[PDB]
Subunit: 331 residues, 4 copies
């Protein structure tokens, strides 16, 4: 008789379906930053890793597995075959197109659409009742792409959007005032990138409107130039890529935070990208970041923020752009 | 329009069942010590409290409910009715017969059976696929009672047993050697109480057999009298009960540790009460503590500890006692 | 040679001062809820318990000790003598008379003033650089008493204040809007009691002013009666005491939350009782809850919350109330 | 009047040193894996990064700082100048030279000695009371190097040693037996690398000696080939490097586990590299992995494992080889 059989008597052989499984698609810096943030927040009873490069994937899986003693996630799996993702509660797409040197914006988006025409159906086939969290950039448009291809209802297709943008706003707001980011409140909404909207009205410490105190907050006659905070937020990624080549930990921590709200059904509010037709004067099938309530059904609700004429027109101008690009995409 | 509807757009009202629900039956010191431990280890997306005293029950629920801002458990419910326990993954029974000043063990058990004849069928009705963790004393006998009434297979009926007895053993072992209890290894097996078997052969730090180093370990010849460590484990509950009237924190943390293993499907080894028929020449339907592997199907496997002839006789003698009581019970 | 000597080589004899030591004065339901909450949030490397009931005190220490296997706080000690508190960063005062059914917090003044004349000098003697977190009621005045007796600067004397009352406000706010309390922002200021001030002008989800959407909010002509939310916050403790005899869990989590911000130097904004002289035209040495920044030096700064003529008047009344009681005290 | 001074009333601009400061030297994959693991286990109130690559260093700093909202470490600083390390409790060294294809072992060590001759005195200058944790390879020798240059007593100079090796040994046990690593007890001692000693005698689940159940375990005629488990431990790093190009997460988690034991004074037993002269007939100043007790003074004690005559010879040969190298180094 075997040592295991001498040591252990077996009552039950057949294991059940995993109950709290998460898949991360793509094992780049962002993918692995999400996985380690998720593994150390104990959100999953099973982690699945998927990417097209077999050796990198098995490597990252074995490195995580070797740390098992220091973790509470008892099964970590990987493969190029999406059968490993079976029965995921949450699937996080970080996989994208490696940006070519002299291509157009439209080229980059359509190469990502071609990768998504493979990933999304494979995700749906093995985890048809899962929430999709789109991290891959450009996040607003690729969240529309994931939506169309998957055929999922709008509540179960979520773009990481202005979540990290808003977390960076609160960090900078915190450094200017000597207050921890947690107690500094402020919202970056609309299109993730240069044309995002800082909501100066909702920007507050302890429910004290910085706009009410300082009427010229966020204007050009602003002597304190608080515009430069949103300018810093919107230029942050560029500055970090400049220095270390990429961004890793901040997005990893922010995606783990979103996963926590989903997996534990918290109904916390996050500024994430959601199909926004019929709201803020938008009449096209586009995704924009607004405060969304995240739980086990994904975006169950969203907050209808009051916006100035300027801010209304900026969200509408971002939608014009996104719809413009989206009708040129080949599905 | 309501402030809520002016503020929030609803995507879907559709509500779902609890995904990681735990129910604690009994809101005495032990039951509430399980609740706060479980609540502060983020093991559940929903917690249900059930006891017979409705005001006490609504007090504890409300007191926990007010801590929500500082918790990651979005739903806390309570009720006399077991419809609030519906869809529980794990159900912990702390409720039981109040110990009469002087009476036989045959009588004390039978008064607990009459209680489990109401508790267990209700639990089974609203949560048919759940795992039962029996904490109520005498834990070994009342785990057999739960098994019989429920009709559940032996894998999904677990008694806390010698799990805390072992935590105490490893704490005291730690004080003697000045090492953390985590790095002190020792096993209390068999019947929870005075008759429990301390396995001296398995007592070690860093895999160094103390029994080999000190052959007298656990004998009456022992110069350092290590039999006192097990004696202290056996008399620990008595000594604490004498000082603060009961035990709370140690059993709450130990059950939460069991709950972690079950809910997160860790597959750790805890010494818990399990149907031990066929093992150690035991011929009767008795439950005793042996090292069991605990996951999302409860006891998947148990460890066959090599015991001395003396150690076997003590387990067989405990089985003759418990079966002697059990066969004279009325269901 | 002993088994311990045969097993372990000693390199150095213990020559180390406590580094992250929290003391809890009082082993009542409040004290032990603070204790377990702090132990399960890994905030301290030494927990010292002090009270006047030597049996109860030793029984609680032993019960915490018996679950050290499941904790990362290696040294738990107790004793009626305050030399156990030596070299504490944070001493949490929960000892003294607690509210009986329907009894005001302002009816515990003279009893707990006497108890603070014993406790505070003893604390100061053994930990003269420690931060005082006052929890005993009436907490606002007893914080002022702790300040006067200790001679400590106002930054190192903190009261639990409206931290829990504010936590409760956001919980009930959350049950109305179907959002997690974490995403529901709103401040209860002034006395931790019946005279507390709900600042309607600061209440927001995602920086959207509820007062601006719903101008009637918190007035008698409000058809949704949002004033009943603040009423519930005031009545909350009375309700819980009536239902289970005391409040323990929620204040334990509220206090561990304040302990986290202090011990980890977060500089988070908490509504805690501090010396409010010079602000809102208050001239006396009054202690009220206003939003404060909490770190390892305690209250480094506070937020000047903008109040409506109505709000400011209602806070000056809460101030007047407490100067009336404070002015006639003996030291 | 600036917005900040309109919003916030300052009491205390007086500032103090951090209390639980950790410094990570080297921002490679290993140092940054330690950084995130330490940040996510809330072990520090200040994290200082120090490397020679100023752009990469500032890049990694900013990437952690942007995730501060999701962290409880309020100050993260970076610089080439070791004045950012001032008042560190624990300084983790991951910086050093990688062996070149032709390079002799002696020459590689001497290149690290020259690097350490700048790093260690700079560390000692700004944190003279700190614990050194040497992760840089070859770990056993560079712990000796760091010890020589620092002038520190042997308790405050720790090599990460066989901590991960042993953690890998317990994973491989776990998969073979279908148990969590936490419940699988095995020890890898001596020189970190292909000469490491797997203590077959100390191999157990629930204190059952596997060597005793299976007499042939760890020998050549072992029908189950358990010797192959140690071979896997010794090759697993080479196999992971071959697949993903380096080792990252498992060493980051393993190091954070040691940081927990030190920063929180747990006194857990870890296989870490310590000055071993006087044990197993070792006459020379060599550092080898033995099971050591780790607290806030580092190695306070160490466990003397009973080894077979064969096993003592393997440590004795490791010592001789290590002294062959160290006696030839230029300090």
């Amino acid at each position: 008789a075997t040592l295991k059989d001498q040591l252990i008597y077996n009552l039950l052989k057949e294991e059940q379906t995993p109950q709290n499984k998460i898949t991360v698609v793509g094992v780049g810096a962002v993918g692995m930053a999400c996985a380690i943030s998720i593994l150390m927040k104990d959100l999953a009873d099973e982690l699945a890793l998927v990417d097209v490069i077999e050796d990198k994937l098995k490597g990252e899986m074995m490195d995580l597995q070797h740390g098992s003693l220091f973790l509470r996630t008892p099964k970590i799996v990987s493969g190029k075959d999406y059968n490993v993702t079976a029965n995921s509660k949450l699937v996080i797409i970080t996989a994208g197109a490696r940006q070519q040197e002299g291509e157009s914006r439209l080229n980059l988006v359509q190469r990502n659409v071609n990768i998504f025409k493979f990933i999304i159906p494979n995700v749906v086939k093995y985890s048809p009742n899962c929430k999709l969290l789109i991290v891959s950039n450009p996040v607003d448009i690729l969240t529309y792409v994931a939506w169309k291809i998957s055929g999922f209802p709008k509540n179960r297709v979520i773009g990481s959007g202005c979540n990290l943008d808003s977390a960076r706003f609160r960090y900078l707001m915190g450094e200017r005032l000597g207050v921890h980011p947690l107690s500094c409140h402020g919202w970056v909404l609309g299109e993730h990138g240069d044309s995002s909207v800082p909501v100066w009205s909702g920007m507050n410490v302890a429910g004290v409107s910085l706009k009410t105190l300082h009427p010229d907050l966020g204007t050009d006659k602003d002597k304190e130039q608080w515009k430069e905070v949103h300018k810093q937020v919107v230029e942050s990624a560029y500055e970090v890529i400049k220095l270390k080549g990429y961004t890793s930990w901040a997005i990893g921590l922010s995606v783990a935070d979103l996963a926590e709200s989903i997996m534990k059904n918290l109904r916390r509010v996050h500024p994430v990208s959601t199909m926004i037709k019929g709201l803020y004067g938008i009449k096209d099938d586009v995704f924009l970041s607004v405060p969304c309530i995240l739980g086990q059904n994904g975006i169950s609700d969203l907050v209808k923020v009051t916006l100035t004429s300027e801010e209304e027109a900026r969200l509408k101008k971002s939608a014009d752009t996104l719809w413009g690009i989206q009708k040129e995409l080949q599905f």
